[PDB]
Amino acid sequence: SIRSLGYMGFAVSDVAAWRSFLTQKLGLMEAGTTDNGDLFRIDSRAWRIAVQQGEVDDLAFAGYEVADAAGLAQMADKLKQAGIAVTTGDASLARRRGVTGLITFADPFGLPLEIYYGASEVFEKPFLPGAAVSGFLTGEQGLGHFVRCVPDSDKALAFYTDVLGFQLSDVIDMKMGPDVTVPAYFLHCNERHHTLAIAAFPLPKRIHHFMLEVASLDDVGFAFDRVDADGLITSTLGRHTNDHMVSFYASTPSGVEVEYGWSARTVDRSWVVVRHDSPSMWGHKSV
Amino acid sequence: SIRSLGYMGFAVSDVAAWRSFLTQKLGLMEAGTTDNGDLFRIDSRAWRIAVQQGEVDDLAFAGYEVADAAGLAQMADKLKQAGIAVTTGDASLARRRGVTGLITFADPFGLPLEIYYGASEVFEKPFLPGAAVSGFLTGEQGLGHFVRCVPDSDKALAFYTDVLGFQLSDVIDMKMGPDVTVPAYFLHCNERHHTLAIAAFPLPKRIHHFMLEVASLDDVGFAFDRVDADGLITSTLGRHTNDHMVSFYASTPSGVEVEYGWSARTVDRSWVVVRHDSPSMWGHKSV
Amino acid sequence: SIRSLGYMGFAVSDVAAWRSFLTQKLGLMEAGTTDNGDLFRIDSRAWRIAVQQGEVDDLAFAGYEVADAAGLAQMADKLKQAGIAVTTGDASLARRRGVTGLITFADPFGLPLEIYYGASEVFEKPFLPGAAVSGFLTGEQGLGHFVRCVPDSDKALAFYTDVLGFQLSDVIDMKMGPDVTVPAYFLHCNERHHTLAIAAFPLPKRIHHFMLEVASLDDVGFAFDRVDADGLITSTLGRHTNDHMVSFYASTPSGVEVEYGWSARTVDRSWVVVRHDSPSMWGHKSV
Amino acid sequence: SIRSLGYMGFAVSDVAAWRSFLTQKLGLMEAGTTDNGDLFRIDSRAWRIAVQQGEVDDLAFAGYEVADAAGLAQMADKLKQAGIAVTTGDASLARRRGVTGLITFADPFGLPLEIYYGASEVFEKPFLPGAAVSGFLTGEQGLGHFVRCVPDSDKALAFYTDVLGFQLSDVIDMKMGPDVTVPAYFLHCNERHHTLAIAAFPLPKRIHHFMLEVASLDDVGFAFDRVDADGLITSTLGRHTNDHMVSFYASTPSGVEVEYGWSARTVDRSWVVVRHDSPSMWGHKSV
Amino acid sequence: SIRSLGYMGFAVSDVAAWRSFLTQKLGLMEAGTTDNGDLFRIDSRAWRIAVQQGEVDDLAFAGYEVADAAGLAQMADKLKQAGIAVTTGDASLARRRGVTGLITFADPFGLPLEIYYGASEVFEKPFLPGAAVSGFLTGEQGLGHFVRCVPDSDKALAFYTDVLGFQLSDVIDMKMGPDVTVPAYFLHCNERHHTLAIAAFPLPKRIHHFMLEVASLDDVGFAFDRVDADGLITSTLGRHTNDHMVSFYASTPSGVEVEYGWSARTVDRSWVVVRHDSPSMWGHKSV
Amino acid sequence: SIRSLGYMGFAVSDVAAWRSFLTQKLGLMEAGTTDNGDLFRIDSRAWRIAVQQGEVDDLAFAGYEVADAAGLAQMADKLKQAGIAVTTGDASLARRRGVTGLITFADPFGLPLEIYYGASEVFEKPFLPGAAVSGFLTGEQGLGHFVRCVPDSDKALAFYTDVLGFQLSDVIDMKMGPDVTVPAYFLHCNERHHTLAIAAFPLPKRIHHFMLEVASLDDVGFAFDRVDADGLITSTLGRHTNDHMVSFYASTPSGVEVEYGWSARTVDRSWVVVRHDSPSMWGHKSV
Amino acid sequence: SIRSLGYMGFAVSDVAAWRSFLTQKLGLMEAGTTDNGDLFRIDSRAWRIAVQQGEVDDLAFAGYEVADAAGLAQMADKLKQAGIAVTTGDASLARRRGVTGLITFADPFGLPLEIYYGASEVFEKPFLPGAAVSGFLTGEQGLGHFVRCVPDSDKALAFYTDVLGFQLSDVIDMKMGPDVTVPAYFLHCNERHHTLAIAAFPLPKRIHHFMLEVASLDDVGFAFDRVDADGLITSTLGRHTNDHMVSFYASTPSGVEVEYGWSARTVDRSWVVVRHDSPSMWGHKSV
Ligand SMILES: [Fe+3]
Ligand SMILES: [Fe+3]
Ligand SMILES: [Fe+3]
Ligand SMILES: [Fe+3]
Ligand SMILES: [Fe+3]
Ligand SMILES: [Fe+3]
Ligand SMILES: [Fe+3]
Ligand SMILES: [Fe+3]
Ligand SMILES: [Fe+3]
Ligand SMILES: [Fe+3]
Ligand SMILES: [Fe+3]
Ligand SMILES: [Fe+3]
Ligand SMILES: [Fe+3]
Ligand SMILES: [Fe+3]
Numbered sequence A, B, C, D, E, F, G: 001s002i003r004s005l006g007y008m009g010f011a012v013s014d015v016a017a018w019r020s021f022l023t024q025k026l027g028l029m030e031a032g033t034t035d036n037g038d039l040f041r042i043d044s045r046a047w048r049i050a051v052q053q054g055e056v057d058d059l060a061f062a063g064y065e066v067a068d069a070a071g072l073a074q075m076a077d078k079l080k081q082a083g084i085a086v087t088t089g090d091a092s093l094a095r096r097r098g099v100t101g102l103i104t105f106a107d108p109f110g111l112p113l114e115i116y117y118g119a120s121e122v123f124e125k126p127f128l129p130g131a132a133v134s135g136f137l138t139g140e141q142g143l144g145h146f147v148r149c150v151p152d153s154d155k156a157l158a159f160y161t162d163v164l165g166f167q168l169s170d171v172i173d174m175k176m177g178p179d180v181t182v183p184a185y186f187l188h189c190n191e192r193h194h195t196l197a198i199a200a201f202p203l204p205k206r207i208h209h210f211m212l213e214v215a216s217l218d219d220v221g222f223a224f225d226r227v228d229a230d231g232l233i234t235s236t237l238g239r240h241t242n243d244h245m246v247s248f249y250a251s252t253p254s255g256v257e258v259e260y261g262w263s264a265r266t267v268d269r270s271w272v273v274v275r276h277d278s279p280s281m282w283g284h285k286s287v
Helices: A015-025 A069-081 A091-097 A153-163 A217-228 B015-025 B069-081 B091-097 B153-163 B217-228 C015-025 C069-081 C091-097 C153-163 C217-228 D015-025 D069-081 D091-097 D153-163 D217-228 E015-025 E069-081 E091-097 E153-163 E217-228 F015-025 F069-081 F091-097 F153-163 F217-228 G015-025 G069-081 G091-097 G153-163 G217-228
Strands: A002-012 A029-034 A037-041 A049-053 A058-066 A101-106 A112-117 A145-149 A167-175 A181-188 A196-199 A207-213 A233-240 A246-251 A257-262 A274-276 A280-283 B002-012 B029-034 B037-041 B049-053 B058-066 B101-106 B112-117 B145-149 B167-175 B181-188 B196-199 B207-213 B233-240 B246-251 B257-262 B274-276 B280-283 C002-012 C029-034 C037-041 C049-053 C058-066 C101-106 C112-117 C145-149 C167-175 C181-188 C196-199 C207-213 C233-240 C246-251 C257-262 C274-276 C280-283 D002-012 D029-034 D037-041 D049-053 D058-066 D101-106 D112-117 D145-149 D167-175 D181-188 D196-199 D207-213 D233-240 D246-251 D257-262 D274-276 D280-283 E002-012 E029-034 E037-041 E049-053 E058-066 E101-106 E112-117 E145-149 E167-175 E181-188 E196-199 E207-213 E233-240 E246-251 E257-262 E274-276 E280-283 F002-012 F029-034 F037-041 F049-053 F058-066 F101-106 F112-117 F145-149 F167-175 F181-188 F196-199 F207-213 F233-240 F246-251 F257-262 F274-276 F280-283 G002-012 G029-034 G037-041 G049-053 G058-066 G101-106 G112-117 G145-149 G167-175 G181-188 G196-199 G207-213 G233-240 G246-251 G257-262 G274-276 G280-283
Touching (some): A002 A145, A015 A029, A015 A049, A015 A217, A058 A069, A069 A101, A069 A112, A091 A101, A153 A181, A153 A196, A217 A233, A217 A257, B002 B015, B002 B145, B015 B029, B015 B049, B015 B217, B058 B069, B058 B207, B153 B196, B217 C233, B217 C280, B280 C217, C002 C145, C015 C029, C015 C217, C058 C207, C069 C112, C153 C196, C217 C246, D002 D015, D002 D145, D015 D029, D015 D049, D015 D217, D058 D207, D069 D101, D091 D101, D091 D112, D153 D181, D153 D196, D217 D233, D217 D246, D217 D257, D217 E233, D217 E280, D280 E217, E002 E145, E015 E029, E015 E217, E058 E207, E069 E101, E153 E181, E153 E196, E217 E257, F002 F145, F058 F207, F069 F101, F091 F101, F091 F112, F153 F181, F153 F196, F217 F233, F217 F246, F217 F257, F217 G233, F217 G280, F233 G217, G002 G145, G015 G029, G015 G217, G058 G069, G069 G101, G069 G112, G091 G101, G091 G112, G153 G196, G217 G233, G217 G257
Parallel strands (some): A058 A112, A145 A196, A167 A274, A207 A257, B002 B049, B058 B112, B167 B274, B207 B257, C002 C049, C058 C112, C207 C257, D002 D049, D167 D274, D207 D257, E002 E049, E058 E112, E167 E274, F002 F049, F058 F112, F167 F274, F207 F257, G058 G112, G145 G196, G167 G274, G207 G257
Antiparallel strands (some): A029 A037, A037 A049, A233 A246, A233 A280, B101 B112, B145 B207, B233 B280, C002 C058, C029 C037, C101 C112, C181 C196, C233 C280, C246 C257, D002 D058, D029 D037, D233 D246, D233 D280, D246 D257, E002 E058, E029 E037, E037 E049, E145 E207, E233 E280, F002 F058, F029 F037, F101 F112, F145 F207, F233 F246, F233 F280, G002 G058, G037 G049, G101 G112, G145 G207, G181 G196, G233 G280
16 A cells, blocks of 8 residues: 655756755755766655656656555556556666565556555765755654645546556545636645546647755745746745645746645545645735 | 534524524624524534524524545435435535535424535634623534433434434433333444433423533633623532533523533543433532 | 722531532632631632621621731721721631731621731642632732621711721612612722722612632633532623622522632723623623 | 443451441441442442451452443343353342342352442441551552452453453562562453453462552541551552552451552553562562 | 751761661661761762761751852851851861861750751762662752751741741641641751751750651662661651651661652742641551 | 563582672672572562573573463474474472473484573562662563573574574674674564574574673672772673663673673664674773 | 853864865854855854864864843953953954953953854754764753863962852862872852863873763764774764763864763752762773
8 A cells, every 4th residue: 555655856958946945945955976877865764755857847756655565566467357458577776776576557548557566765874955844754754745636537547546446535626727626635645635636738849847844934035035046936925725835936947836835734544535626825926 | 424413403483582692601602693593602613503583483494514425425325315305405505505415304203414525614704702601612523412302212323323424422211200210322423421311301492401511610600700790590500420521401492492601521442331310429409 | 098899708508518518619629618607718818708607698798808917907007096996806717718917897787807916837738729720819908898787878988998998999870770779889999999898778688799810711611500500600701890790699698798700901000980880781681 | 331340349357347447447338238339439429349247258240331322232242152151130139239220140260250330329427437548549540459369360360451452561579589480460450450460379369469549648547547456467568560559568357458549550552561579669568 | 148958977886786776777887987986878968978976966066158258258157146156167177078168056955057058069089879779869959857856946946947947838737646736847048948956855865867868669668677677667658748758767776767759849949838737648567 | 473582590619609799789689599400680580591500611501581371382392293302391490490390302413401481489578689770671561581502503493483483673793803704693582672693603602692681780889899890801891783781791600701781772674684794883992 | 141052163274174174074053254264063052163264273262152242241240340351343343253241351371262142053054064963952952162271270260260250069189190190170150060070181182082972872873983984083982970961072183072972961959069089981982
């Protein structure tokens, strides 16, 4: 069973711009360059985000974490019984990712996904942010979340819930005009309100945004000014209706957006699915 | 499995009187008028109480909430296997209620019931009470509770526990005279002491009372004076023996009573069924 | 300096009625009969209330407590410098009261007052209430409070604040009719909102009421029913605007009223004098 | 499944002595006399201990509480499948005990036992102790515990654990002389360290002692002096090695001993069975 | 101003008996032998109790601690202005006591007293008790307390309060027979209820007892059994009425008694002097 | 199911050196000598470590604790179904160990192991350390842990996880030179990060080290100096990367090392297996 | 009145070595270079440590902080009345230091001192350490402390306590050989155990060491390894006897030592002066 989103890899046209953006604007820690690409940290793990040179300028792969080898076996079996082509990652790939074991496959629309266990910790190299950030929230909630854009939401939903095991948190009916309303589905695999969201948005990218959560309001406020100085803000500070995250959105060098937030609520055992007609309580003014 | 009482609808002869009573006396928030009727809020949900014009001057329907679509499927199946006529609510009905999916049916004595999932939240329209009330207690405990009057308690008990899944909290042997003692059964489906009570009381209404729970003693004290000013109090402040609710009772424009309370105790895992010979520890003097 | 109200003595026409009222209705503990009269306890002190046979059917004397012999000396000196006739209580009187040292005198309108130190504790005879009461609130807040009726409030104010050292908490402008408004002054000598209140009310008694504070709402609720059973309630449950005490009032066998309350707020160092136009926030309906 | 020890009944030769001992020495509340005998309370339940006139001067019956009717059915079935003669208590018996339903049977050595559900609460008649006692500890831990003397411990163990479902907490090897060592087995059915203990002690009674637990050390200290005044102490204050109860033992009018304690530790999920060679850490000097 | 009782010295006929009693029964730590005598510790200080060979078999001297050199100067001045013969301790004496500076003098009845500042700490030699004791309570409350027997209490009171600055906590009227009642005065110089008590008891020793306070009830319970094994208990476990200390008394090899207690209450700013007619709430049965 | 490591026995050439090392350096409590050997305590259990005269100068046996007799039966069955030679410990062996029941067998490489239930508690003989130690951490976490050296880690892993039920916490890839990297596997059977670790280290002993955990940093700091005084430190203070234990290592008289630590983190339900490339975050400099 | 040590300035021969040492080893934040020198931060203040090129390779000046202009006036007056040459810092100096007002003078042995008020905060430039450090402890405790070496301790004591107002915390008698014992005096001006210590040590520098306090043990552990890598450790980890600081000492490029610690205890109102014979409880082994 998937425990959380563990890592993400981006294939971008401008690696230097990405390096500067991640460290100086967002405050991630530069963790070296390997055959896995330029590595970035936000906690004790050896890396959480990898940046590789590539033409797509988008999310290249995402890795979901299971607790152990048994968990990996379960998932591989579940994917096979569903008719999904699964490849047992070879030692070389496992080494490049710094994991113990992994399997690779793709979602129904071509996004390369990896399920792994036994990632590397580096407590001996204490995390030091690239900018003043009190801390990032990971732990049992994993890396954060991202919104996957798809041409068919029902097909995507069936795969992510029936095959991968994600559970529905809630739905937001996004009014994208008078004649268009698109439901966005938010899914969880742990306490974090959502680790994955699915929506049929007509975007030129695989994901609408990825999100990183910080420890204090000031972390968000200071980062906003750093990003705003370069004219990269896409949405002012606001609070979402479903996860209650206080955040702003900004544009990365690839056009893909990043959400930088604080104070999201978690999903508990008494949680019930609900629907919303608005994505934000206040703020989040498009700029 | 039913998680809580989610909403209630009343069919009344005087809609204006009801509007004024709910907002000015009890402090509910007016939420607009739709084809679902005049809507009222007590929390983040789009509505909890609907008031429609009707001749019965009584509870018209009650909606029980399940966590998701799977839960809805389970219940529909459970009702069918029991020989109950269930109707899958059509899109039009689902839209009128503001829910994702629902099924309709009736209890053994004709009360229309609905089981649904995916109700609408409106965090973007923050709750503002119609009178000074610090807050209402809902959350995982749902809307509150109501006492269903029935001609046959054993038949009612079998349906609500065996088919709907409610669990018995306790029983109060109501001495309604020298020659008459009527047992009132209190049932729970979550932490709230009781979401439903059943009793063979000879009343001209479907329910003896419905209850709303507030956050502080002052909320109750202030409301008492507001209601008392119009001579609508039916029972002075007191505390019940079973749920330990401190409350007063008042008459709504339909004759049906409302209980407005505070500080009820909850049901835990070590709870055991007990019996009582009195409904109140102190107070609750009939007026 | 006066630390609190320590004890009170009543001279009544019906001692048996008083005994029954104090123990069975209010829950005080019967502490024996001495030359000091029938004694009653509410805590570790040997007695707090004394009931003696007398014709006035009213408060006979009140004792204010100082911390020690130095404190007693200070007060005696303060009274003398003000021209008040002070009598050093003789050993016989000290023994009757169970105190170490005391001085006696009267307020400007004839109420016998005593200031003492070194009262008797009886921890070896644990307090057991005469009725189900979880506990009374005394400690550093003393016995409770009483409202002294006077013909001239300014003369009374000068004596109690300038000579006895009480400090003003607040004032309530009591509208006793279209042509009459009487200010009630509330004074403190410790954390308790008021230990003494002064008002020019046209009553046939020395005090309007005396108050006892209990530990829980249920103590008040149960006592209300006990008193109500005998038709002795004079004012329904309510909460005062100034001390925020939730209480009811009842008639003692002498006609003097008793207030039985819970949850009063205390006076702190940042307290500021304010005025009110109403004595109650809610409730306290005269009956 | 048994949730706790709910009530006990004693058949004694001197009912008046028992009444005085329970109320004045131990502080129980006299709850009236019915066809069930003289009733005594220690909490919200209508009664916990019944005293009836009888020749045995010993424990006459004990009632174990289950959560509901389903629980009662389970136990009846379990006893039947074990070949135990079970009698469904008739309405008359249920009424005498003040319970909803019950079954009666006996342990392998003749002690009448009852398993019931739905006992009566009397919150409207607040508990008032017969002596100064801050409170008794019951709740989910039930009444307390008793040590059953038996001629064959293994036969007794098989019945109480295999049939009744009690779980072993620990064992104390009681050295009753050079040539005699008797193991005492302590069993639990809830958090209370033990609700029942079994030992092959050569006593003329069915039980060695029954125990009541109070809320504070002073409750124990004051009670000790009350009992000691009549020369009824059998064991000085001490603390047990297994349940860590601080207690003293005294003789009841029937010769059966009562343990009055405070501060016992509870059994949790990580509990493991252990053995002891001494019953007390300190104190408990036989007198 | 005196901050606390810092150390005590005993002059005894049997030093070995004292060594064994203090370490094995009471659990003090043996700290070596110097020209100051056999030294014993209960905390971080180099020593708190000194045992020297002597004929009196009694308290030889007591040392009161001031905060600093200024405090020492104040006290010396206060004693001189009172006509008391004060001697500035010489370097040799200061070295023997392990203090920075000290003055010596005697109370009105010949007890040698010392006031000092700058005692020695030995954090580098962590405290290890001679018997199983979780810890002793010292800190700002100092060593503990002792009751000084005197032929004239008023003369003793004047010296200790007017000259030494101790403040009265309370008084206990000790009935030592039909024709004799002796008041015991309890005095404090910090939070500890009393550091010194004065009473005109006809004892052959300078003090009735000295007290040591431990951290848990078990410390007291275990020590009781250790002492009881040698038949040295003089008073069973009990709780005092004034300081609320739960303790037992035992005889030291010199006949002087020691009180070993736990859970005493402290004196605060709102403390008021009171009187008691009994020294104990419960227990403390003379043996 | 195994609940924890309960006891360990060492067979050494110099029993006196071991006695002195354990009590004076580490602070264990000497618990007597029996046919089980010299016994040592760290908590309420009768013994945790046994030292016997022997030629191996190494760990002689280790005992794993199960909750009860059922647990013992389960394990015996599990071992038998795996083809392991199990011997039901005879009464004589059970008596020597002070346990209720036990089974004996060996791990794949000859280490004698015992699984037992019902060990002996000695609350009546309160723990008193041999040196100043505030306390040892045991409870549900058991004795501590040890690292088992093996010639084949996969064979060892299969036995300890598949047969004994231990679960993997994490792995550390120990670089023991340019051409050698050895994975160390850390396993848990309760909250303690690891109760057992397995590694193919080329050591002349059965275990690399055993660990004892204390309650405070000072316990570790003081012990370090005691051990350092004799030149027995093998590794300076440091903190491990996986269990986060702050500790130092020292050499026992047998050459086997002991780790003395504080502040280790525990394993929870959301734990996931990870890998590390370093065994320490800081410190732990080999000396 | 002096509130704390606010800033320090060093005049060194190798500014680059100092820059690298402070940021990379200790983790201070580089704050730019001004006419005040290379500036370093540890909190919200614009700078706490200044490094200037100079020949002394020692502490060049220290600044003590007062609360306001009135405080500055008081101190200037106090110094003048003592005959100390005080210079009112000119606007140019105030600007260079970034303060509102300041006075300059020297201690009896030539150390330039400054007393100022109104230093500059830079909350808009959030603190980011030069190495992984969770945080430094400053606030009301100021920068930290330093030990001033002097030829005459009594002369130094008189100036710092009588003129500057520092209060004595404690004294440590430093045995610097058989024939030499030197008392070190520790003084406080706020909660920090000591802000200044004075000792007649024969060192070639003005101060023995300066200390910086961090927020966690790991901060100390990681820094130790960073410093140890360059062979700069002078004293291993240990805990002091007086302030209870857990720290290590290292050599700065100027030879002056720096103490880097954690978990020091504070001085309260009930503090009393004591003496010690050892500077450390454990550790602090000279290397
Ligand atoms: Fe879920
Ligand atoms: Fe998002
Ligand atoms: Fe339930
Ligand atoms: Fe209700
Ligand atoms: Fe005031
Ligand atoms: Fe009042
Ligand atoms: Fe259990
Ligand atoms: Fe017992
Ligand atoms: Fe005082
Ligand atoms: Fe005492
Ligand atoms: Fe696990
Ligand atoms: Fe280890
Ligand atoms: Fe100070
Ligand atoms: Fe220092």
